[PDB]
């Protein structure tokens, strides 16, 4: 029967789609955590930029 092969294909497709749902969910969670992590890294980047710029400013001023 060809309808049987069709329905079997439908079932396999359904299960694989569910697996893709789990993958999409875990993917999304990891993406969110990495976005927060990027925010922290950028905050530290601005702080270290401030410290380096100020230290180089005073260091250049102390020339003499």
């Amino acid at each position: 029967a060809r309808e049987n092969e069709m329905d079997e294909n439908l079932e396999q497709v359904s299960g694989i789609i569910g697996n893709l749902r789990h993958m999409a969910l875990d993917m999304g969670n990891e993406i969110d955590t990495q976005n927060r992590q990027i925010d922290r890294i950028m905050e530290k980047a601005d702080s270290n930029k401030t410290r380096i710029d100020e230290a180089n400013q005073r260091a250049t001023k102390m020339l003499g």
Binding site: M6, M23, E30, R40, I41, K44, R51, E54, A55
Partner: protein, 74 residues
């Protein structure tokens, strides 16, 4: 009349639907592979982001020490 053409139209459309389901299977399999590779890449980039954040921390500590030394020179 068009009776034979009607039956062959039913079998033909059924064939197109079946091959459509085959295309579905191939597409969801490729999507599956690309998704897995995407997850692994996200793991690599994630650990890299962790070591980058720890690097920023070490830069912050060292630069704080250099700030202290500059305040000692001042």
């Amino acid at each position: 009349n068009e009776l034979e053409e009607m039956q062959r139209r039913a079998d033909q459309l059924a064939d197109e639907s079946l091959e459509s389901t085959r295309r579905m299977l191939q597409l969801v399999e490729e999507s599956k592979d690309a998704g897995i590779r995407t997850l692994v890449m996200l793991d690599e980039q994630g650990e890299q982001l962790d070591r980058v954040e720890e690097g920023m921390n070490h830069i912050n500590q060292d630069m704080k020490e250099a700030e202290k030394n500059l305040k000692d020179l001042g």
